[PDB]
Amino acid sequence: FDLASLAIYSFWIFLAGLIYYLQTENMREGYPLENEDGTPAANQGPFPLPKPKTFILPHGRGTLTVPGPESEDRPIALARTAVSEGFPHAPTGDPMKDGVGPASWVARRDLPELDGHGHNKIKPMKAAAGFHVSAGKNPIGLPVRGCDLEIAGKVVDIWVDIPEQMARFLEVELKDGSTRLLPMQMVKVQSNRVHVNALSSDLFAGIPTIKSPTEVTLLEEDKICGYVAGGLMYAAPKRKS
């Protein structure tokens, strides 16, 4: 056998170990598998858990070690629809309020993400030095329309990402005078309004709310983004088209 035939045989062996490395490298969240009852699954599949690695998080926020002991750290309201594995799980309540399905949120650190300088990554624009709208229609002051074609509230500020300089949320004011953050990726900015297809007008009050008006925390975001996305499924009887 010649030189080329070695290089090619040698390669296929390299490639498999790579696939193995990659596959295991990708088991650092979500594993070991569970039965729907939360106990460890009998079948883990052919690949072993990797050895843990440890991330040092900036600004004294500690470390993360993956893979690690895993859990939701929250009550999940759902119940089996059938007597064997592999079926859907019926929500035991209001799925939006309960935070299940498309309405799901992870329980992330309840603390805002910080920029590399240790400052909040996300500010309402009003408190963001020298930040303004550079291009496109300015949404501020527009009324907000829910998918029921009713007016949910009005836009009172844009929450921006300081180091990436983009708009992450529209702060929206409801009838009672309190506000809510709407994911920027989940609204349509029109010339005469801002439209939200995911939520009906009446569902706007239900949006999870933040603690400090000047900042928002990872956990809070997840609850907000989760709830909003969930309306795509759960608001369908209120969506006209």
């Binding site: 599949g45 900036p58 592999g86 859907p88």
Partner: protein, 281 residues
């Protein structure tokens, strides 16, 4: 078996067809109506490719090939041994890809995410349909489409391109290669930049989205940003497949001569055409 975080997302709903009938999983795999269609099509055609592996005579995979109807059958049907199998199997594969895509849509609605993935998968499906369907129909014969075989279909890439000279000269093909080359460069970078960050020098702290911006602004003097590089990747990719389908829809229809010759339009432009000097004067 479920991922540790999985159960909270497996909830009734999201289906395009049949309500709660097919709404359930087998192991990890979501099923739904289009899971079922996909199986049907994919398995039917897989049985049919197994059968052509009889009429051909061999069970070896480097060998088995299903050739299209010959150029004399035109757009009509052909006997199963004579390329009729191909037509069915082709129809089958179209059935499995489209089912697969809409299945992803169904999976999408249930997860409350956007449809971007099966939208992007559409372009692949679309490229394939160009080669096996659109281009053959514009041309008049099924036989102009590529055979299904590991090596023999490669023969058809060579045969086809060399009909037109060195195929490098198809201009849509050029734009296609430019997008692939760039995508792969952009994939390499993107992957590197997130990795260099999450896994910085030994014992240091994780870097930040700012460190990423900084690195590239340091390096090339511009950073496209973390929303942009995903926009970029998606765009570079789909553009490559778009110009691939295009480069091949125009070849054998609007342009059938040697592609290199298409370029004389520029060179015979009246202002510089007859000037002496250079290569063409």
């Amino acid at each position: 078996a479920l991922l540790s975080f999985e159960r909270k997302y497996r909830v009734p709903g999201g289906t395009l067809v049949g309500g709660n009938l097919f709404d359930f999983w087998v192991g990890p795999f979501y099923v739904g109506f289009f899971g079922v269609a996909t199986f049907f099509f994919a398995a039917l055609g897989i049985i049919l490719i197994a059968w052509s592996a009889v009429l051909q005579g061999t069970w070896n995979p480097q060998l088995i090939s299903v050739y299209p109807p010959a150029l004399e059958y035109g757009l009509g049907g052909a006997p199963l041994a004579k390329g009729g199998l191909w037509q069915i199997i082709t129809i089958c594969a179209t059935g499995a890809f489209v089912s697969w895509a809409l299945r992803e849509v169904e999976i999408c609605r249930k997860l409350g995410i956007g449809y971007h993935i099966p939208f992007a998968f559409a372009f692949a499906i679309l490229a394939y349909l160009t080669l096996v369907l659109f281009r053959p129909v514009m041309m008049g014969a099924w036989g102009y489409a590529f055979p299904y075989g590991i090596w023999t279909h490669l023969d058809w890439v060579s045969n086809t391109g060399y009909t037109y000279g060195n195929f490098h000269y198809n201009p849509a093909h050029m734009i296609a290669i430019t997008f692939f080359f760039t995508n792969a460069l952009a994939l390499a970078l993107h992957g590197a930049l997130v990795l260099s960050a999450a896994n910085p020098e030994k014992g240091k702290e994780m870097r930040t989205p700012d460190h990423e911006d900084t690195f590239f602004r340091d390096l090339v003097g511009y950073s496209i940003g973390t929303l942009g590089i995903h926009r970029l990747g998606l765009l570079l990719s789909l553009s490559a497949v778009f110009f691939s389908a295009l480069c091949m829809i125009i070849t054998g229809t609007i342009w059938f001569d040697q592609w290199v010759d298409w370029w004389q339009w520029w060179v015979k432009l009246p202002w510089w055409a007859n000037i002496p000097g250079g290569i063409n004067g």
